[PDB]
Amino acid sequence: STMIGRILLTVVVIFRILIVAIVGETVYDDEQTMFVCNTLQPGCNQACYDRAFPISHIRYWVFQIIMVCTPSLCFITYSVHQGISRFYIIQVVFRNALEIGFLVGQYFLYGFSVPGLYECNRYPCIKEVECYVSRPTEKTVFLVFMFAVSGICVVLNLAELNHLGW
Amino acid sequence: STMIGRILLTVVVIFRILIVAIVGETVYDDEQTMFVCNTLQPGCNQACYDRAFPISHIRYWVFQIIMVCTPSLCFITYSVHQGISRFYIIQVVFRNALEIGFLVGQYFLYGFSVPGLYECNRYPCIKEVECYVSRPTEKTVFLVFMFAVSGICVVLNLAELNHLGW
Amino acid sequence: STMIGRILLTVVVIFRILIVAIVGETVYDDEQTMFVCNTLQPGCNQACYDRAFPISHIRYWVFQIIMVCTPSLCFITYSVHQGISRFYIIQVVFRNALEIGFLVGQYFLYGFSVPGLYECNRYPCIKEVECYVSRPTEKTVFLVFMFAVSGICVVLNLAELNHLGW
Amino acid sequence: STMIGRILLTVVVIFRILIVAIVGETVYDDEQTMFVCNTLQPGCNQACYDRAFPISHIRYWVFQIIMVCTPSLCFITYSVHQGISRFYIIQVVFRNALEIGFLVGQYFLYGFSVPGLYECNRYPCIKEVECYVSRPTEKTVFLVFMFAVSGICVVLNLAELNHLGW
Amino acid sequence: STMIGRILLTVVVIFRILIVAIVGETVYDDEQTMFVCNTLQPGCNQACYDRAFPISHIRYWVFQIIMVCTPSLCFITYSVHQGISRFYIIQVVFRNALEIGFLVGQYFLYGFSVPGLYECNRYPCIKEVECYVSRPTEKTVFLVFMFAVSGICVVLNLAELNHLGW
Amino acid sequence: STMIGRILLTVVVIFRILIVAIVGETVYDDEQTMFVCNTLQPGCNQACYDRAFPISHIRYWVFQIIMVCTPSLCFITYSVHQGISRFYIIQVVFRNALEIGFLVGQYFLYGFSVPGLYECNRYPCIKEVECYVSRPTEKTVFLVFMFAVSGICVVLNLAELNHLGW
């Protein structure tokens, strides 16, 4: 239980990268054209959208992917340009911290589901108008899947840390 | 009947990859713009679409493709990083299981055909609205073709397992 | 006149692949947006289109291209993985059969021309409405050209089979 | 005056390919959306377009590019699969013939200019309606440029044939 | 504190390039179609847009990326083409200057935030009409992030210059 | 003052290539959809556009880029073959001439600025209607920038010719 962990980790990482690059880019293509509210005011759709989804999902996840691999890049570089184990320790620690932080943030911003009805009260929208949504179920599914994958990665990293460190 | 099976399987897999990649990305490009219902309510088209096609076909099939090849990647990385036959056995088993599960799921979610009329009763739609569809026949054909290919793969894997199994 | 056959065959195949990949993807980009009928019913354009063109030409031709090269791939594989002439014979036979079948199917489904007026009576369309097509002449030209190329390939394969046959 | 010809010819060929590929694909992107006629009939815009520009320019020129290089491909493959002088001679002849034919056809189909007003009398269009055009001047310029390049190629090939002929 | 600076600089640069290339090309895809003002005049939307955002952030940042790497390219060239430390020093100086200038310009043109309401009085707009922006929050976040990264690069370059200077 | 010139020239050339191929293609994507005039006639927008911008900027500059590098290609070719300096002289001369001609043409066709209003009197437009423009402030910057770069290249080529010439 000290060798296969690395295989599983690398494999889930590549799995995640592939699923994020092949699919997500087009699910969120019609998020603003088919987001329609019930009113005549010019300026309510944009505001209610910006307030519902401030930071889209897929960009959060791209940022996650990138900022989760920087320690490996730093290791690659410091190895090409040349005490050593110390590096491994610190990079493992930072990896764990980043994973945990991003998972908690994912829970706090978006949640576990995506409904089909929002209610906005922003200006210029007159009191409490209703606004609809597109493709909610696919987005729910994608949310849950990525949550699970990130949890698996957390577990593996923690087991490795416990096995290695004091 | 113990050698040509591998060739047939590999060729079928690549055939499937190529078809899915080249063709089935533009058939499903106008699935929401040309999905039109008979009503004036703002919010019926989106809901009736989401309820008709929750998870599109092509994303199901991309996920299938990826999650069916992971054991080969695990084998690859374990052979690059270095009891052995045991690995072959377990990955064969997992391959068979995944393939069967995905085929059964494909039957249970979508079915064998795609009609040209859907009656929806979701909110905000008034009682039993009617809604139309785009390019049903191509989608039927694509369904049937992929079903057949997956069945062939199932048969080949079963024959291999039997030839090798106790 | 016993060797140049290979030259002509390979060159024709590559010619066909190039013409299909460079050109025939934007001609059929506006096939449903500029297909307009004369009526107010919601749901007549989609039905009359699906009935006129159930399977766009270009996907038929992509399928034709792929499913005609599979014997060469199987040969490549069985060679990398290792009585032999027998393989050549069977794959030649299968190539000829596939080519003939696809040509006949191409004649039976579509035809030799593409008119500029269709008449549909499908539901919901009330009796016998008129519908207009886009870019008919280019499609006619492309039909004829591909028919000719496939015929040339048929002739070459037949001559080879005769030269080799008993 | 027997070596620089090859340089000039290859250079103009690559120049032409580059220009075509880089530029032409987007000038002709809005040829049907901004082609507007003065009438209310459904079906006049499509017909008057099809009759004005049956075969677009850029596809003619792609076909021209391809069908002019086939002899070189044949020569390459035959030199890989193994007289040489006879082959060189026949392929030169075919190159000259193809170039001349395509130039004459280019003159006969399109012409030297592209006006900004067309007049169609086709069904369903009631008698002699007027139809407008988009980006005429760029298309005129592109026409003239390609005409000149092809003429240069003709001249070079003919000078070579003379220098070599009997 | 004289070695790890290199790895941090390189990694920050690559991280910035990756972010700018993967994400910030579709956020600014619908900046003019969903920019809507409250008036009937033809010509107010275009003018109020041009006056609000004369130079989109992403063009500025692409220019920044390119014009900051030119000294390294000049070094590469002058090396392939062949006193030397002098070159290193002058290019360090130019790098620092360019970075500082671009940061200050970024502060002066755009600012620290992007609001959701603009008020324009340009011709032809009659007397101070109101106009609504799209996706303000993502753009604010992007602004802040790039500001921070550029500041980090500034600090590292300053420390390097001091470690080496007189 | 006889070595660094080559470096500066190559560097500005690649700089120009990149700035033209990375961004300049999307600024001019909405040049005809958001070009709107004040009238009801069908056929005034197309005519007034064609008369305002006959030959767009970016295509002029692509043509410039290509037709400025042909002498280097001819040199590459004639050098792959195996009196020689003569080639260098003539190619330098042609480079200088082409650059100067393209700069002067750029001044004569477009100018130094791009305004926000154009009055057109072409048929069918009735008696000097007014027409508006999109993004009239990025295009000015792009104009000025390319003008400056071309001027730098002119100066460097002139200095080289003088240093080398009689």
Does E50 contact F at CB distance below 8 Å? yes
Q: How far apart are CA B1 and CA F63, in angstroms?
A: 61
Could you tell me which chain F residue has the CA closest to the CA of E61?
F23
Using a CB–CB cutoff of 8 Å, tell me whether F10 touches chain E: yes
* Residue F163 dihedral angles phi and psi, to the nearest 5°: -55, -30
DSSP F24: T
Structure tokens at E166: 């007189």
Give CA–CA dist D86/D109, Å, rounded: 35
Q: Which residues make beta-bridge pairs with B132?
A: B117
Return the partners of chain E (3 or more C-beta pairs < 8 Å): A, F
Beta bridge partners, E44, equal none
- B-contacting chains (≥3 CB pairs under 8 Å): A, C
Work out the angle between the directed axes of helices F4-22 and F57-80 (0-180°, nearest 10).
130
How far from the centroid of its chain's Cα atoms is residue F92's Cα? Answer: 20
- Consecutive H or E run containing E146: helix E136-164
Q: Do A18 and B77 touch (CB under 8 A)?
A: no
Report the gap between the CA of A1 and the closest CA in chain E (Å): 33
Neighbours of F165 (CB within 10 A): 9
Chains that touch C (3 or more CB pairs under 8 A): B, D
Using DSSP, state whether D109 is helix, strand or coil. helix
Residues of B within 8 A of C68 (CB-CB) are none
**What residues of chain E lie within 8 A of the CB of F22, using their CB?**
62, 66
Helix (H) or strand (E) holding A118: strand A117-120
Residues 6+ apart with CB under 8 A from C129: C37, C38, C39, C44, C48, C119, C120, C121
Partners of A77 on chain E (C-beta within 8 Å) are: 6-7, 10-11
Neighbours of chain D (3+ CB pairs under 8 A): C, F
Q: F73: nearest CA in chain D?
A: D11
DSSP-derived 3-state class of residue D120: strand
DSSP F60: H
Judged by CB atoms closer than 8 Å, whether chains meet at C62 and B7 is answered as: no
Contact A34 B46 (CB under 8 A): yes
The distance from CA C92 to its chain's CA centroid, rounded to whole angstroms, is 20
Tell me which residues of chain B, numbers 56 to 95, contact chain A at a CB-CB cutoff of 8 Å: 56, 59, 62-63, 66-67, 70, 73-74, 77-78, 81
CB neighbour list of residue C101: distance below 8 Å, 6 or more residues apart: none
- How many C-beta neighbours within 10 Å does residue E97 have? 11
**Gapped junctions in chain E, after residues (C–N > 2.5 Å):** 82
State whether residue C15 sits within 8 Å of chain D by CB: yes
Q: Is the peptide bond before C124 cis (omega within 30 degrees of 0)?
A: yes
> Parallel, antiparallel, or unpaired for β B117-120 and E117-120?
unpaired
Option in D11, D14, D137 nearest F54 (CB): D137
Beta carbons of E11 and A63 less than 8 Å apart: no
Experimental method: cryo-EM
Contact C62 B136 (CB under 8 A): no
What DSSP designation does D126 have?
P
C-alpha distance from F11 to closest chain D C-alpha (Å): 22
Among the listed residues B134, B129, B125, the one whose alpha carbon sits nearest the alpha carbon of residue B38:
B129
Rounding to the nearest 10 degrees, give the CA dihedral for residues A103, A107, A112, A114. -110
What is the rounded CA–CA span in Å between residue F163 and residue F166? 9
Task: Closest CB to A132: pick one of B43, B54, B66.
Answer: B43
Cα gap F134→F116, rounded to integer Å: 8
What single letter denotes the amino acid at residue A12? Answer: V
Measure in Å the smallest separation between the Cα of E126 and chain A Cα atoms. 18
Tell me if F116 and E47 make a contact (CB, 8 A cut-off): yes
Spatial contact of C104 and C87, defined as CB atoms under 8 Å apart: no
Q: What span, in angstroms and rounded, lies between the C-alpha atoms of B7 and C76?
A: 10
Give the type of residue at D101: G
